[PDB]
């Protein structure tokens, strides 16, 4: 544990095989500055404003991925190590701002203890699938080298609606459902 | 203006494996003290680390001994890693972060006092500091001239 006023992570290169699954991010004090869309070869700023005040060449992320892709292959052939087991992720659902009926808001599903970083987080409203108004983050690294990830649902708070965050993962025998309603307390 | 980045070093050369590399810059009193650490992680185990307090790569587990030794034994590889404290950590903090992260100020909103949507984190019963993941937090703030 290193003490500091601030920590910049410049950056984070995650790769998995099989599947050729890559991710490249920058962090500052635990928040994502950007990720590099590896298919579009493009820097994606989490705060659009930051992308208007600073810049980052996405090729730096692409080349980081090429290095770790090569490193992982060598390590896998060199090691006799058994792969780490799948973890069971744990989810929490909370609104972004104070609930005011009729006042637009965002429902946050915070998913932790993710390992490996492959997951499906989706939303349901009154047991009906909800695809519109959904945004999710990259996989954030944790100290124990599991990951977390947040999914967001924009919504109008009303009395009747029941929301579920649904999490599907290799470490779960069955999908986990976390519930929230406007009256509920976290 | 432009973020620079850390260059991970390269191994000399059906089962699911996860690899992770990270370049960490720790700042205290601005850039009066910078501590710089890179971490090479395989299969949930950090196995090689560079730490500017140490000044060379070290094997965190036995698996990392050949790789730490190789990276230390190539003068260009070792000096370029050492230099990243300055070319990445210091440069980013004094350049781009001074236009983005270090200038962000989001004013907080206020049986319950919901103090929400503020940044940065310095601010009978109130839950722990929760991180919204969108560069705000919820739970007398740097964004406020006066404290109702």
């Amino acid at each position, epitope marked *: 544990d290193i003490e500091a006023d601030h920590v910049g992570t410049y950056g984070i290169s995650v790769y998995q095989s099989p599947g050729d699954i890559g991710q490249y991010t920058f962090e500052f004090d635990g928040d994502e500055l950007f990720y590099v869309d590896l298919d579009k070869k493009e820097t994606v700023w989490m705060l659009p404003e930051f992308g208007q005040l600073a810049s980052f060449d996405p090729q730096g992320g692409l*080349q980081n991925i*090429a290095v770790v892709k090569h490193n992982l292959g060598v390590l896998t052939k060199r090691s006799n190590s058994t792969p780490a087991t799948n973890e069971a992720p744990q989810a929490t659902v909370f609104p972004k701002s104070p609930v005011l009926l009729g006042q637009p808001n965002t429902l946050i599903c915070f998913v932790d203890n993710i390992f490996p970083p492959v997951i499906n987080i989706t939303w349901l409203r009154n047991s009906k699938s909800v695809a519109d108004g959904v945004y999710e983050t990259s996989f954030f690294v944790n100290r124990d080298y599991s990951f977390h990830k947040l999914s967001y649902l924009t919504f109008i708070p009303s009395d009747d609606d029941i929301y579920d965050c649904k999490v599907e993962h290799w470490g779960l025998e069955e999908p986990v459902l976390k519930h929230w309603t406007s009256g509920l307390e976290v | 203006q*432009v973020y*620079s980045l850390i260059r991970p070093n390269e191994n000399p050369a059906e089962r699911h494996f996860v690899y992770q590399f990270m370049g960490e810059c720790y700042f205290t009193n601005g850039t009066q003290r910078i501590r710089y650490v890179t971490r090479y992680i395989y299969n949930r185990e950090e196995y090689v680390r560079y730490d500017s307090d140490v000044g060379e790569h070290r094997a965190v587990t036995e698996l990392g001994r050949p790789d730490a030794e190789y990276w230390n034994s190539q003068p*260009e590889i070792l000096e370029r890693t050492r230099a990243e404290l300055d*070319t990445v950590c*210091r440069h980013n903090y004094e350049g781009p972060e001074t236009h983005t992260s270090l200038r962000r100020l989001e004013q907080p909103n206020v049986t319950v006092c919901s103090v929400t949507d503020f940044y940065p984190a310095k601010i009978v019963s109130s839950t722990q500091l929760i991180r919204n993941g969108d560069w705000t937090f919820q739970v007398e703030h740097p964004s406020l001239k006066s404290p109702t």
Partner: T-cell receptor
Amino acid sequence: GDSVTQTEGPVTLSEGTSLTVNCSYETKQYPTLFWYVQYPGEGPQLLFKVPKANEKGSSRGFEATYNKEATSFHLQKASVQESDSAVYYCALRISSGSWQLIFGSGTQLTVMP
Amino acid sequence: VTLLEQNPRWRLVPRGQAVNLRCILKNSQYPWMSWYQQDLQKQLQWLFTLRSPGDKEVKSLPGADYLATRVTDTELRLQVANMSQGRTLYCTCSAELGGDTQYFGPGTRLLVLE
């Protein structure tokens, strides 16, 4: 913009006289600075590098100082030899993108024996 | 000894035609293969660094359209099309990503002939 500007030339010197090829650079990053040399009929090749600000590098009697305050990397040799006839390129690299080289336009030198 | 071979060494390119260049890495310990162009005024300019087999990328510069491919660990390719101005294409290699010593290959010289 990150860029390198060097003497236009062409330069012609008598053998045994001194050479100065000026090089300015512009970047907000922390560059590593280089000279490359290209002899007639060959591709470019590294002459020397300097990664630390205010340090000197040198090779084959050439030298250059990474002058941070003047953002300069001027090439000097006290006593040119006929075999130094070549094109000299100032270049920088920054830790960004593909860590690629950005080259000055090059300065041709002819040394009369 | 030399680390790189480039085929062809010279080519005349009729307008509306494309040409295919190869760069052969003779020593796999220098796997970071790049393309640089040098124009008719001797200006050098990086085009591509492609580490992994299967990598492909396109880039359009004044005077030429480029398609680069890393075909194997020892084989880098370049297709040059819509070439309105001659140039020289250098393959380079280094032991690490952006290594301090870029080794320049023998070069492919392209000319448009009307």
